[PDB]
Amino acid sequence: GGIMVELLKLVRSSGCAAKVGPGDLQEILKGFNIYTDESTLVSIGDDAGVYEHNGIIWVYTVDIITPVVNDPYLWGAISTANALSDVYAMGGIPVNALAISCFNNCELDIEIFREVIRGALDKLREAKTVLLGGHTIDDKEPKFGLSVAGICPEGKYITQSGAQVGQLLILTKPIGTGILIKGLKEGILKEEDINEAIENMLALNDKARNLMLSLDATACTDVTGFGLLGHAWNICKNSNIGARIFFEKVPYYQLSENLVKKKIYPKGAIENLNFVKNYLKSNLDNWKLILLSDPVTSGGLLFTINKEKLEKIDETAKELEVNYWIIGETIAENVLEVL
Amino acid sequence: GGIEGRHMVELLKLVRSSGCAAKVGPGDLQEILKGFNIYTDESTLVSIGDDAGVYEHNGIIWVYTVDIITPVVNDPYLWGAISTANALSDVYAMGGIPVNALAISCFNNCELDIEIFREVIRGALDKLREAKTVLLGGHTIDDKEPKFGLSVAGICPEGKYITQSGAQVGQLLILTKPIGTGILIKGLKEGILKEEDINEAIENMLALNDKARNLMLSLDATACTDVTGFGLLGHAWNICKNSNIGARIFFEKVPYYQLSENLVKKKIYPKGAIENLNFVKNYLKSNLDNWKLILLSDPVTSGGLLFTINKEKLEKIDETAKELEVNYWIIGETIAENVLEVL
Ligand SMILES: Nc1ncnc2c1ncn2[C@@H]1O[C@H](COP(=O)(O)CP(=O)(O)OP(=O)(O)O)[C@@H](O)[C@H]1O
Ligand SMILES: Nc1ncnc2c1ncn2[C@@H]1O[C@H](COP(=O)(O)CP(=O)(O)OP(=O)(O)O)[C@@H](O)[C@H]1O
Ligand SMILES: [Co+2]
Ligand SMILES: [Co+2]
Ligand SMILES: [Co+2]
Ligand SMILES: [Co+2]
Ligand SMILES: [Co+2]
Ligand SMILES: [Co+2]
Ligand SMILES: [Co+2]
Ligand SMILES: [Co+2]
């Protein structure tokens, strides 16, 4: 029956963000004896590795994802913004990159591949980051991403571990994209219906980085694959504190709520939920906890600041053209309290 | 009647035999990326096209490369270590020294298990330790077809980076590792061979190209690359095309595993060998038996360096190599006719 290209149908049904598990990940790595040196400032555990050389603080990160929209050009641009996000999350400036392309020449074709690259290039141009090469491998399930090298000007870098009790938790982009992507995959939604989320996914976190630094944030991370709760916990766990988050204060797309209540969501949201339930204190309905756990693609920065900094926050945000939402505060008890 | 309750896990059985023929040959991707408006800057010394990207910052010459491969053996630890040596190879091929890296892991938590994944990582870490390269992080994604590799950043001491573009007619072609691994890997995949039949090949795939880099720099090589996916003819051709010259390769001087020859003659070789042979068909001048051309076109994994040196360096090639403890084979010479002559 039934009276363009569909990339999503080439991804294994009912996904997440294709990642392979939360915290337990960086925990495996911890059990190994890794060669490191005097230049290694931050190794495994944060949004990016930090390495000093010739007096310069470089940051390095890599991220690859499966299709999140059916338009190849937009997938390329969004994946690029996603990879660059971790540089911004460290307070760094992207400098150069390499592309990692997994695609099957007969399950698609050069034309589609060229559109993904074009989207990536245009976003790198906007981020003034130079693509220096890459690698392409035959893969039935298409994936695209980048390894990125950046610099932290004047040697200042923001990790996930300096947060203090009594600080405000600030978020710069809404959550709920994973739900929308599941909606597109099932053919219930089209790109036009989620133009606002697409715009947020395409947006570079460079303006949020500036805002973040301007407010002298103590800790910072970006919200991606492990959901808002999982990424908030990384700050908590690394700073040895807790967080109280108010569901009512969290920005999300109305459509994400309508779909999630109809049990339409990526299986990844459930896995993220299950991982944090070991430190979660909440009596909210599950549709709320699934929404808060939902994998986010190219999400905003999540950081901590002092109330006192709220003085010129909206002014700063304005001139910078970046939104922000106060979603909660850090607490002494090492738990995640969602009210 | 006595079934092993213990699990098996054949990494090689999880690798797919693509039914799609390679459209991208030696240098094509570079030509393709030219039909794009790419943002670049004054610090970009070498962009898309060589073994690594070259970028200048306050006088420091950095090189960047990335490579990920599917399993080439069944041992997880060996696979991780080989993949690591393979990724570092491109930094060495530029004359650089690897500094730090990030790991890219594609694995299925249910068609394998954390324990095997830990073994891949352990092999990678031990090889990076040997390379004095710091692993700084990475990304892990769920994938039915296991894949593993690294993006690496290195530095070219004294600002000398060697490209595929500076060779000239009359120079000698030097290779530092045997070819033929693609055929051996195919034999392992078909259950014809076992790891124990290819210990020598495994040792070579595990070896870092650092000593070869020292030999290459000591002889002031004019051009260099490493032999990987496009086979010996294909990678030799990359130097030729970028240096606008041709090459004469003497099969009798080319190093390869005896088992690789026996296998090709019985048609046990990867389809990639036919695809690599097809890529160079319009520039190939040869009347050798075809098993020879197939072997010379066979995709190599974590291969050696391939570089050009002026004829007068021979006087010190041998003493320098013994000192450095690295093998080398003089397999040919560059020529004026932009053709690939295989004798
Ligand atoms: N295969 C691997 N090898 C080494 N380090 C790895 C790794 N996979 C992940 N890591 C590290 O383990 C931590 C968690 O990885 P990720 O979840 O990818 C962080 P992220 O990129 O900020 O989130 P995102 O993947 O949802 O975008 C990071 O420090 C990451 O660098
Ligand atoms: N997806 C991509 N985006 C940008 N550049 C890419 C790319 N894929 C490959 N390239 C570049 O195109 C040229 C050929 O790629 P490769 O064949 O991967 C070089 P190599 O790593 O030396 O060979 P190998 O892959 O057999 O190990 C290189 O300059 C590579 O950096
Ligand atoms: Co991150
Ligand atoms: Co990262
Ligand atoms: Co990330
Ligand atoms: Co490559
Ligand atoms: Co950070
Ligand atoms: Co190479
Ligand atoms: Co490379
Ligand atoms: Co390579």
Ligand SMILES: [Co+2]
């Ligand atoms: Co990641």
Ligand SMILES: [Co+2]
């Ligand atoms: Co080179």
